[PDB]
Design a binder for these strands. Structure first.
Ligand code: NA
Ligand code: NA
Ligand code: NA
Ligand code: NA
Length: 1043
RNA sequence: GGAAAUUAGGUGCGCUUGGCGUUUUAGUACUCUGGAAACAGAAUCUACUAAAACAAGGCAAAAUGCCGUGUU
DNA sequence: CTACCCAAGCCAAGCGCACCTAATTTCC
DNA sequence: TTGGGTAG
């Protein structure tokens, strides 16, 4: 039939509501669910990618230093340098002789940790933060008379350690020390100047941001030109043309001419500047003064400033005129007419200055110009600052209309329109459905991008199954992400705690239990300092408590135009003032005779109220002092745009995409958005359950409410004015009072259909991506007990943190797990003493150090033992793991990584018994065009699971795939335990965590299913994006993945 | 609403580095044994320093070498 | 099996371009 | 939230 589509677009969900356009009965409703596309995910990938390069290039630096030492025959395979201490050698080499083994180990150590380059220049007063800027400053002061190696050696002898936060130095300080060392060791070893040059180079050299990665990288570029051209944007009017450099000469001339052509001069002659005038202006004030002032242009044209209007202006109110940057930058170093009067050359100098990023490359590229530039000039030009960014137009666009700017008075947009040049757009005439490719182009957040792409796919599926709707109404989340969302929640709860405490304070003080029924009026009362804002008369709290009906909550701006139901549009006033005011603004009401006070007296009170701590809302101030005319349509448009509709950038982009698609394919579909604040008002007034603990269906419930709102706006003729604005159609009945407003929207008994609806559908996005995180980073050592079991060795760090009770619980439950319990028991007894004395304290080690200022030290008869900074203890028995012991030679024990991230599991039915094979991310291998499962790993896993050749493959299960275990349908999380045949699932219509909360069940909030001989049946289900269920069938395990 | 410009603020993608962190091994300290000491042996607990590995792995051949946790 | 338990790499410094917001001038 | 070992 004819239907209205409502969309609730969220961070992790897209809820849709389908309701009849006439009957207002719900056809269908559901939720599309997916993971939040938060920026930290890709940040993690980029961060790891950067870390790999750092480690790779650091290693490559060392190898080259060693390869250099090999070539000069200071190092051999046979040469042994193990006992040597670099800090001792590096200091000794500064004034004495070193062995070929002792000298090289000093050079190698320097090459490994070479310090920073960029931080160097600027000192920072020490706020005692562990900042690089602060630390570098602190070391420089302490490096005044000493070299780096010297200072480190002193710290080593004096403090016992070198490494840490302090070990941050400038690269120059290392190089300075290296140079001195090489100068002294120069006499004792046969080295040429090529040696000392190559090493210093190797020590200090690092890639630049514009140089990028090496030759192979898909992230790299061939040269600086290709690098910049890829990044820079394209012209608005010529898409094929690259933008001009922001400060090209012709670009700024274009800017200056637009300024002059926008001017209006009041005089007997023409009000617009003639060509000869603009020529004189450009030459006599623009090419003469760096920052042209209004006076200079006025003096040139022989009028006063007051006669000149229509000029760009700064926030101070001072005129802003285009600065000819290149012209003056070059003029200052050279006044030769050969250079300055050459626009083309000035253009080329600007481009070179902007594209390339260092003086040296600038010089070379400037030299390649074969201009009339003196080399002395070129070197001077290369140090010019501020050549960054692009103009929004190409030189092609700029040069084309430059004469027109000179000889007409039309600005750029007037000329472009006259020339029939339209800003580039994307055609959707060919598209069979609403495209998803365009989303990134107009989006800022990764979170919003995914939500939009999913939203579009939801729409495309709905129109395919249901046909086109007349109306699409959309609401977006207030939060940009979940972290931001949680912050909103915290502030909400905190405010609630404050108000709830305030109410308790009143019932204890007055004994009037009525206060819990007057929260909003009390909130207003406290916020308004106990005065009626319209009469400025005092509102005694006792009278408010006893007779609350005498004091009315009035809406500042009438909701007939404001559509604002929030606390910001509410004021507690006397019933008499609220009655007299009617459908007016405070300004309109207080201007009339009906009012007790003048608007000025009112304005004064509000302004003082709006300043200071606990002040009135800023939005409230803007409302209370609204002096525009409410009946003016333009003003009504502003309020609708602020409070009734969603005019945020992301919303506009998506909405325009939909409208553009429909208009081009000539589809009569009306698209609109709605402010979340207004829908919340509806849900509140339509008496929906306050506590949203029903699970995912709330998203579909919201979309139905959103769809119902669209229905209401198309039902009434008084809402036709507002409906028109929401649908953005070009251009009367209207809501006249507060009471009328309530009648139209507060209709709780007309939406029972929504609440009674119980046919919600759910769609969970399935993840099948290969090569995600393969395994946890942490390296673990192992031990073998007397029983023969290999045990994981864990570390206890942060023993002196306040809230760290890990050690206390460990000793009370299992002291024998401490390796220190078996070896060095003297220290254990020393620890146990500390533990027993502060048993009540969460961390006995914290309170100790807090009181003594000293840490637990290893036992020594001389009381000179070392501090204990972390304690090893035995963990669980080793099982599922990654053996990487081979990376560590002659290691007495196994070295492992843990948590083998599963890709999927394949269920087999083997002789009436269900079993499954766990496919790890480690088992999926990449090829140039595709991923494939390791057959040797799969068969091995098949054998370890005792799967037989007779067994038949049932299905594969990825994350969020639907599974029916013994007749109950769940969604797959993943393999929880391969060895114990335990897979983890969750509920489809709700989280299992919340399900237990509703039941007040204290069981662990995780569903673990065991696939064993007691398992009766396993089926694989799936859904469309709308949440419609269906069963699947397959014959063999997919071993090839395309990516 | 759209076009250009000026200032301030913000978001993302990409690049370039720093010092940590985990682990092994070696040396030293610490503990234990013998000894007048030197020193040797044991232990590998705690600490410091150096060398090496750090998503499994895949390329690549003197290289400011390259890829491997994102999206679809 | 149920009902537990544990533990999971991290900060700081540059840079390019794209995009957005707010304010100001003109015009379409 | 999730790999996965543990007590009973
Ligand atoms: Na480009
Ligand atoms: Na620049
Ligand atoms: Na009055
Ligand atoms: Na940025």
């Amino acid at each position: 039939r004819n239907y209205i589509l409502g969309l609730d677009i969220g961070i992790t969900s897209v809820g849709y509501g389908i309701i009849d356009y006439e009957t207002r009965d719900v056809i269908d409703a559901g939720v599309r669910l997916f993971k939040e596309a938060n920026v930290e995910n890709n940040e993690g990938r980029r961060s790891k990618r950067g870390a790999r390069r750092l480690k790779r290039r650091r290693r490559h630096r060392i190898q080259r230093v060693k390869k250099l030492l090999f070539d000069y025959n200071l190092l051999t395979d046979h040469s042994e340098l193990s006992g040597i201490n670099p800090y001792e050698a590096r200091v000794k080499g500064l004034s004495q002789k070193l062995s070929e083994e002792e000298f090289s180990a000093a050079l190698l150590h320097l090459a490994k940790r070479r310090g920073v380059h960029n931080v160097n220049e600027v000192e920072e007063d020490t706020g005692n933060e562990l900042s690089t800027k602060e630390q570098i400053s602190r070391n420089s002061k302490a490096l005044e008379e000493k070299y780096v190696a010297e200072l480190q050696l002193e710290r080593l002898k004096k403090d016992g350690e070198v490494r840490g936060s302090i070990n941050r130095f400038k690269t120059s300080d290392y190089v300075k020390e290296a140079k001195q060392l090489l100068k002294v060791q120069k006499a004792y070893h046969q080295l040429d100047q090529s040696f000392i040059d190559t090493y210093i180079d190797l020590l200090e050299t690092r890639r630049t941001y514009y140089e990028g990665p090496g030759e192979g990288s898909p992230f790299g570029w061939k040269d600086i030109k290709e690098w910049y051209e890829m990044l820079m944007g394209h012209c608005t009017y010529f898409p094929e043309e690259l933008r001009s450099v922001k400060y090209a000469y012709n670009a700024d001339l274009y800017n200056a001419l637009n300024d002059l052509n926008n001017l209006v001069i009041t005089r007997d002659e023409n009000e617009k500047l003639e060509y000869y005038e603009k020529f004189q202006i450009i030459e006599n004030v623009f090419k003469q003064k760096k920052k042209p002032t209004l006076k200079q242009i006025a003096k040139e044209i022989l009028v006063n400033e007051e006669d000149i209007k229509g000029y760009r202006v700064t926030s101070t109110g001072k005129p802003e005129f285009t600065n000819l940057k290149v012209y003056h930058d070059i003029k200052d170093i050279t006044a030769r007419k050969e250079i300055i009067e050459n626009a083309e050359l000035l253009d080329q100098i600007a481009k070179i200055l902007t594209i390339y990023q260092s003086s040296e490359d600038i010089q070379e590229e400037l030299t390649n110009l074969n201009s009339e530039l003196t080399q002395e000039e070129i070197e001077q030009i290369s140090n010019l600052k501020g050549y960054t960014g692009t103009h929004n137009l190409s030189l092609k666009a700029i040069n084309l209309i430059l004469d027109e700017l000179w000889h007409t008075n039309d600005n750029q947009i007037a000329i472009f329109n006259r020339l029939k040049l339209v800003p580039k757009k994307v055609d959707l005439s060919q598209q069979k459905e609403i495209p998803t490719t365009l989303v990134d182009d107009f989006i800022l957040s990764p979170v919003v991008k995914r939500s939009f792409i999913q939203s579009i796919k939801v729409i495309n599926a709905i129109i395919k199954k249901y046909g086109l709707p007349n109306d699409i109404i959309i609401e977006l989340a207030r939060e940009k992400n979940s972290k931001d969302a949680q912050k909103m929640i915290n502030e909400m709860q905190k405010r609630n705690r404050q108000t709830n405490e305030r109410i308790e304070e009143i019932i204890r003080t007055t004994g009037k239990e009525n206060a819990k029924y007057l929260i909003e009026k009390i909130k207003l009362h406290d916020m308004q300092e106990g005065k009626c804002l319209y009469s400025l008369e005092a509102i005694p709290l006792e009278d408010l408590l006893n007779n609350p009906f005498n004091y009315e909550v009035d809406h500042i701006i009438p909701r007939s135009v404001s559509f604002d139901n929030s606390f910001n549009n509410k004021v507690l006033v006397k019933q008499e003032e609220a009655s007299k005011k009617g459908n007016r603004t405070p300004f309109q009401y207080l201007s009339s005779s009906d009012s007790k006070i003048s608007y000025e007296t009112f304005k004064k009170h509000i302004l003082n109220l709006a300043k200071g701590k606990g002040r009135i809302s800023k939005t409230k101030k803007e409302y209370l002092l609204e002096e525009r005319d409410i009946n003016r349509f333009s003003v009504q448009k502003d309020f609708i745009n602020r409070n009734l509709v969603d005019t945020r950038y992301a919303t506009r982009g998506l909405m325009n995409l939909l409208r553009s698609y429909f208009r081009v394919n000539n589809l009569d579909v009306k698209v609109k958005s709605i402010n979340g604040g207004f829908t919340s008002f509806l849900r509140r007034k339509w008496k929906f359950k306050k506590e949203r603990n029903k699970g995912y269906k709330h998203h579909a419930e919201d979309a139905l409410i959103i769809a119902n709102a669209d229905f209401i706006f198309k039902e009434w003729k008084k809402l036709d004015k507002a409906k028109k604005v929401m649908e953005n159609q070009m251009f009367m009945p209207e809501i006249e009072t507060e009471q009328e407003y309530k009648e139209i929207f507060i209709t709780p008994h007309q939406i029972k259909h929504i609440k009674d609806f119980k046919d919600y559908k759910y769609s969970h996005r399935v993840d099948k991506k290969p090569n995600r995180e393969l395994i946890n980073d942490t390296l673990y050592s192992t031990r073998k007990d007397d029983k023969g079991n290999t045990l994981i060795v864990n570390n206890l760090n942060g023993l002196y943190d306040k809230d760290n009770d890990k050690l206390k619980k460990l000793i009370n439950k299992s002291p024998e797990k401490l390796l220190m319990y078996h070896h060095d028991p003297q220290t254990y007894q020393k620890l146990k003493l500390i533990m027993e004395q502060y048993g009540d304290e969460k961390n006995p080690l914290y309170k100790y150090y807090e009181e003594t200022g000293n840490y637990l030290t290893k036992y020594s008869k001389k009381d000179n033992g070392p501090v204990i900074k972390k304690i090893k203890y035995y963990g669980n028995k080793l099982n599922a793991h990654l053996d990487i012991t081979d990376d560590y030679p002659n290691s007495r024990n196994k070295v492992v990584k843990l948590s083998l991230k599963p890709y999927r599991f394949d269920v087999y039915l083997d002789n009436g018994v269900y079993k499954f094979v766990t496919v790890k991310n480690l088992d999926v291998i990449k090829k140039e065009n595709y991923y494939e499962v390791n057959s040797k790993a799969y068969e091995e896993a098949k054998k370890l699971k005792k799967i037989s050749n007779q067994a038949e493959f049932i299905a594969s299960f990825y994350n969020n795939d639907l599974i029916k275990i013994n007749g109950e349908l769940y969604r797959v999380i993943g393999v929880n335990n391969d060895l114990l045949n335990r897979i983890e699932v969750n509920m489809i219509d709700i989280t299992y965590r919340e399900y237990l909360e509703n039941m007040n069940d204290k069981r662990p909030p995780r569903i673990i299913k065991t696939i064993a001989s007691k398992t009766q049946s396993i089926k694989k289900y799936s859904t469309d994006i709308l949440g419609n269920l269906y069963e699947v069938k397959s014959k063999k395990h997919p071993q090839i993945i395309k990516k």
